[PDB]
């Protein structure tokens, strides 16, 4: 929601190669930047299932 006015009309829109949350009423952002994994590590990481990781 909006921290100042309290408007809950926050919309997800893609910027110029940037993701953030912004309200359409006052144009104020509440959370900018997103953390995503790289494919350089994706091929190195190994898979783990629930059954094998529970016993």
């Amino acid at each position: 929601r909006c921290p100042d006015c309290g408007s809950t009309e926050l919309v997800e829109d893609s910027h110029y190669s940037q993701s953030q949350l912004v309200c359409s009423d006052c144009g104020c952002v509440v959370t900018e930047g997103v953390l995503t994994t790289t494919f350089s590590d994706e091929g190195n990481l190994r898979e783990v299932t629930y059954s094998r990781s529970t016993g």
């Binding site: 829109d13 893609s14 190669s17 940037q18 930047g33 953390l35 995503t36 994994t37 790289t38 590590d41």
Partner: protein, 1097 residues
């Protein structure tokens, strides 16, 4: 009195292309694999049985591959076209079945049709549906008739198996070691084992080194162990020359130092030197008979042939220890080319052996304890094993054969669909065995042995320069023969048995050794008669035309090569200063009385190998024929490959220019085929108005490139204008680009899958989320249809969904979360088609073909078919372009300064020929080492009233005054490249970061930022800008604020130190996030960095 010349001689080239040539190699190899080799592999493992419960067996009778089909239907096969396999993202394979007989309960049961696997079918093969079809039937199957084929289609992608190049097996190689010692090596490889044994002279004596021995042993001990015990016989076998005995003296002395004088003592010594895998004597004898020199066969423990072989090897080493006659590895006469056929044969053999082993294990596990219910193999004939093996080996490209210990990578590559020339050139590629292991520069160089076999100029510019090559226009790869009649003719031609005489005859100057695929065939005298008779018998037809025979007078060895993979080239036989081919034969060939096979049978044209042509004399032209001539070159321009054939007048240009031109033509933009509209690929570049070149080579007519051009002819004027073409740049006309010149189309693919999971739930597409305020879909869901799928014909903008995909989160009511396929793109795209298909897994595959129409602008890279790559510097209007007396304004203005440094006279010749052609309505030829001369085009120009040098009177368009110097106008065939400024333009905001290290990503498609490498840091250090470097590498990249405790020096969190359980000494500190990651990793490695903080003052 000039020698008469056959003008129509070049007509021998197309006829050959009717039976062989560019793409026929892989097709014939795959046909031989699926028709002959597979049956031999099945016969080699026809019977498989288990040790337990004897009298049980599984006998294979005959294996069939059938026609390609698809298992989409429920337990029903259906003929499927390769285009349908491309669309449905499936494989184009045929069911491999086999008929067998087995024993269930000692009652023999026979099966006549039992499928066991699926073999991917190469296109245009014998069993492929595309062969034997007319262009109309190709249109009915949505396949281009001009498509070269020969590539596999797996999971919807087109993979091509490159021709592998390796060293010839079973051959002695004399080479220098790291310390300068000139030793020998032999890699004996049979159908079962491969072993490389070496011999060195490190201490004046010859030591033999093998992987199965603990320490290298003297050669004289091995001689004594192999039957021959007298030292005199050993010396006679080595050689009778004084220097030979002087060199072999130390070996005899070292042997006499020990007490080894009999075969038993030598065998005991070897067994003592034998590594673990009298018993030692038997193991030594077995290693000497089977493991060492596998290619040399012993009848019944008779090492006479092996003794002669090692004696000849020692003699060659002694002769090489003097004059530095060291053999070279880059000599292509000792190279072998493995096609896809041999690789697929080895892979199928390995897979069949694994399947038989698995079946035997299952039998041993099931039969002895299950029940009175008799076990049968049919209930365990796994059909997915071979299929999955083939699919993975073709798709991933990594081949791991444990039975042969072969670990190869990059065998299969994605077929490049940039243009027709791109695929046609990638189909005839050849990779090296080195694969960039070291910058040797030896094999990367251009060896003279590549004459007529591989294209000299065609090579990828970059790190792979010299390791990836292309075959010539007229070349052929030989196959394996039976080798029976060769041995029979050699024995009948007077070749005495090597076992009948001692090795002393090997030291005679007139006695020449005859070999056979590395095996000592025997000795002979007057080898000239032998070679002449063998060549005459091969020409007569009693011996296969691919069997090569060569003679080395330095080593005095007659090599007879009959193994496959050797490169051969056709040559016209010349006898007594006159070629056998006359004008009458060429007239009969043109009229259809005879074909190339008739030329082969009538002793007119014969195939020559590199080793064979090493001893023969070839003439380039008829006027070059002298008394000592044996063959005549068919056509010189056949030296170039497929890509290099596109170069008009390549003999007038520089070699780096030709290399760059081939590299850019492999990336040239143009039409792909007649089915380019129904084809849906991940990236396709098409030209709006493609035009065939005015100066076309004969190779272009041979490869039918004129039917599918990849460029346009524009009136280029070579001059300097406005200074916007300083370095390689070019100026384009605004009106030309406005009237359709250079207009291009980019087709991209967007694929989505709706698959069913383990639970009884499926991915479903929701309808467009209509806005209740306006009763219309939202801007994001505007292009969606009623079914939630975007409809063709509309325009797609950035941040717009194409398929409103929603997937369940469970795998009680299902909970669906939205994962729509959004369109990432700077510019708008138009939907041409939306294909919806259904696989056997009930997964709906939706493919949208987005289209973008792009106009040439500043930044687009253009080529001029001469390696003169350029970028559009300025787009001036039509009025600003200069005009001639006729009123023609140029479309492209190129810098003349690029001509002196590169010496591209071929471009000027092509321009003049094209101008003459467009004046007289003709197509001039830019054939290599020939073509239309300058005098002819000059006469054509002077006849039509134009200047005989291309330069015309031109008035400046800007000032309206005539120029002091004439401008060189003419039509040039310019081709646009795929390198666009729109796709290469990139800008990076703050954006996302990586989870491990909080830094921007790498690639542009991943929204990545630029990397200030080590060299950039070095430059910034040299400049001395400390604050700029700090802002770039710390503030703007991975800035973070950590909490460090001033007592223990460890890292805290939220102003608290868990180590000391206090927070009074904890202070904040700015730091790169990578540095904190390094500190944490070091603390994980027990290397604890203790930070002692202090005030900044």
């Amino acid at each position: 009195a000039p020698i008469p010349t056959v003008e129509e001689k070049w007509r021998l080239l197309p006829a050959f292309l009717k039976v062989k040539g560019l793409v026929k190699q892989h097709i014939d190899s795959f046909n031989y694999f699926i028709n002959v080799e597979i049956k031999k592999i099945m016969k080699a493992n026809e019977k498989v049985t288990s040790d337990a419960d004897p009298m049980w067996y599984l006998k294979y009778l005959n294996i069939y591959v059938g026609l390609p089909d698809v298992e989409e239907s429920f337990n029903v096969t259906r003929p499927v076209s390769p285009h349908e396999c491309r669309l449905r993202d499936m494989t184009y394979s045929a069911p491999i079945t086999v008929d067998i007989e087995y024993t269930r309960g000692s009652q023999r049961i026979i099966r006549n049709a039992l499928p066991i696997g699926r073999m991917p079918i190469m296109l245009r093969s014998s069993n492929c549906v595309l062969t034997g079809k007319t262009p109309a039937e190709f249109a009915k199957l949505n396949e281009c008739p001009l498509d070269p084929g020969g590539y596999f289609i797996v999971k919807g992608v087109e993979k091509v198996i490159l021709i592998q190049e390796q060293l010839s097996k079973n051959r002695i190689i004399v080479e220098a070691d790291r310390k300068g010692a000139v030793g020998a090596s032999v890699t004996s490889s049979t159908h079962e084992k491969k072993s490389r044994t070496n011999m060195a002279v490190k201490q004046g004596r010859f030591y033999l080194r093998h992987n199965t021995l603990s320490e290298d042993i003297p050669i004289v001990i091995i001689f004594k162990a192999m039957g021959v015990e007298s030292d005199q016989e050993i010396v006679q076998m080595i050689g009778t020359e004084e220097h030979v005995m002087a060199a072999f003296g130390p070996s005899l002395e070292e042997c006499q130092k020990a007490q080894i004088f009999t075969q038993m003592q030598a065998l005991k010594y070897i067994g003592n030197k034998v590594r673990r895998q009298k018993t030692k004597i038997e193991e030594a004898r077995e290693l000497l008979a089977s493991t060492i020199l596998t290619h040399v066969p012993v009848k019944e423990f008779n090492f006479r042939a092996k003794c002669i072989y090692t004696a000849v090897m020692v003699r060659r080493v002694i002769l090489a220890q003097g004059d530095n006659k060291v053999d070279d590895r880059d000599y292509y006469g000792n190279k072998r080319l493995e096609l896809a056929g041999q690789l697929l044969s080895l892979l199928f053999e390995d897979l069949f052996k694994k399947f038989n082993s698995e079946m035997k294990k299952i039998a041993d596990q099931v039969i002895p304890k299950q029940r009175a219910a008799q076990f049968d193999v049919v209930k365990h004939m796994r059909q997915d094993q071979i299929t999955n093996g083939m699919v993975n080996a073709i798709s991933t490209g990594n081949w791991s054969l444990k039975r042969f210990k072969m670990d190869r990578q990059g065998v299969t590559q994605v077929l490049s669909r940039l243009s027709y020339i791109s695929a046609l050139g990638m189909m005839t590629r050849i990779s090296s065995q080195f694969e960039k292991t070291r910058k040797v520069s030896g094999p990367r160089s251009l060896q003279p042995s590549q004459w007529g076999m591989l294209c000299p100029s065609d090579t990828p510019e970059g790190e792979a320069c010299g390791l990836v090559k292309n075959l010539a226009l007229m070349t052929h790869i030989t196959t394996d023969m039976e080798d029976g009649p060769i041995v029979k003719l050699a024995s009948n031609l007077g070749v005495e048995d090597v076992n009948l005489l001692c090795g002393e005859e090997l030291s005679y100057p007139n006695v020449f050794l005859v070999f056979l695929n590395g095996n000592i065939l025997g000795v002979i005298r007057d080898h000239k008669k032998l070679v002449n008779t063998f060549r005459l018998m091969r020409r007569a037809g009693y011996i296969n035309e691919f069997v090569s025979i060569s003679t080395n007078l330095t080593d005095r060895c007659v090599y007879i090569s009959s193994d496959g993979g050797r490169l051969c080239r056709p040559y016209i036989i010349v006898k007594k200063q006159k070629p056998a081919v006359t004008n009458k034969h060429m007239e009969e060939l043109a009229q259809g009385y005879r074909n190339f096979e008739d030329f082969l049978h009538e002793s007119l044209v014969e195939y020559l190998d590199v080793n064979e042509e090493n001893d023969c004399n070839i003439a380039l032209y008829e006027h070059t024929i002298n008394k000592d001539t044996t063959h005549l070159e068919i056509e010189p321009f056949t030296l170039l490959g497929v890509c290099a054939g596109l170069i008009p007048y390549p003999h007038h240009n520089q070699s780096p220019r030709n290399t760059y031109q081939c590299a850019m033509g492999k990336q040239a933009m143009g039409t792909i085929g007649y089915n380019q509209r129904n084809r849906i690929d991940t990236l396709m570049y098409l030209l709006a108005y493609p035009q065939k070149p005015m100066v076309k080579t004969k190779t272009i007519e041979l490869i039918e490139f004129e039917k599918l051009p990849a460029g346009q002819n524009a009136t280029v004027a070579v001059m300097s204008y406005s200074g916007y073409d300083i370095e390689d740049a070019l100026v384009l006309n605004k009106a030309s680009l406005d009237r359709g010149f250079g207009r291009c189309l980019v087709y991209k693919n967007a694929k989505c899958t709706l698959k069913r999971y383990t639970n009884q739930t499926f991915d479903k597409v929701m309808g467009p989320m209509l806005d209740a305020a306006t009763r219309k879909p939202i801007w994001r869901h505007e292009i969606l249809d009623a079914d939630g799928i975007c409809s063709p014909g509309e325009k797609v903008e950035n941040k717009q969904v194409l398929v409103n995909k929603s997937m369940p989160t469970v795998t009680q009511q299902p909970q669906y979360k939205d994962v729509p396929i959004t369109y990432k793109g700077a510019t708008d795209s138009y939907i041409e088609k939306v294909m919806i298909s259904s696989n056997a897994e009930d997964a709906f595959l939706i493919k949208m073909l987005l289209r973008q129409t792009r106009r040439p602008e500043i930044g687009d890279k253009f080529s001029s078919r001469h390696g003169q790559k350029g970028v559009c510097g300025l787009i001036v209007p039509q009025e600003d372009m200069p005009f001639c007396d006729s009123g023609i304004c140029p479309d492209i203005i190129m810098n003349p300064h690029g001509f002196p440094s590169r010496m591209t006279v071929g471009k000027l010749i092509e321009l003049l020929a094209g101008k003459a052609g467009v004046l007289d309505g003709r197509f001039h030829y830019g054939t290599a080492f020939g073509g239309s001369k300058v005098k002819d085009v000059c006469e054509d120009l002077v006849r039509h009233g134009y200047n005989y040098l291309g330069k015309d009177y031109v008035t400046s368009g800007i000032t309206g005054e005539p120029l002091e110097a004439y401008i060189y106008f003419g039509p040039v065939y310019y081709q646009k490249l795929k390198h666009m400024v729109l796709d290469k333009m990139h800008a990076r905001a703050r954006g996302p970061r990586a989870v491990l290290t909080r830094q921007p990503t790498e690639g542009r498609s991943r929204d990545g930022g630029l990397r200030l490498g080590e060299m950039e840091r070095d430059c910034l250090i040299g400049y001395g800008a400390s604050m700029l470097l700090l802002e770039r590498l710390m503030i703007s990249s991975d800035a973070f604020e950590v909490d460090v405790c001033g007592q223990c020096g460890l890292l805290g969190y939220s102003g608290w130190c868990h180590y000391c359980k206090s927070s009074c000494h904890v202070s904040s500190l700015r730091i790169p996030y990578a540095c904190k990651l390094l500190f944490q990793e070091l603390q994980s490695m027990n290397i604890i960095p203790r930070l002692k903080l202090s005030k900044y003052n």
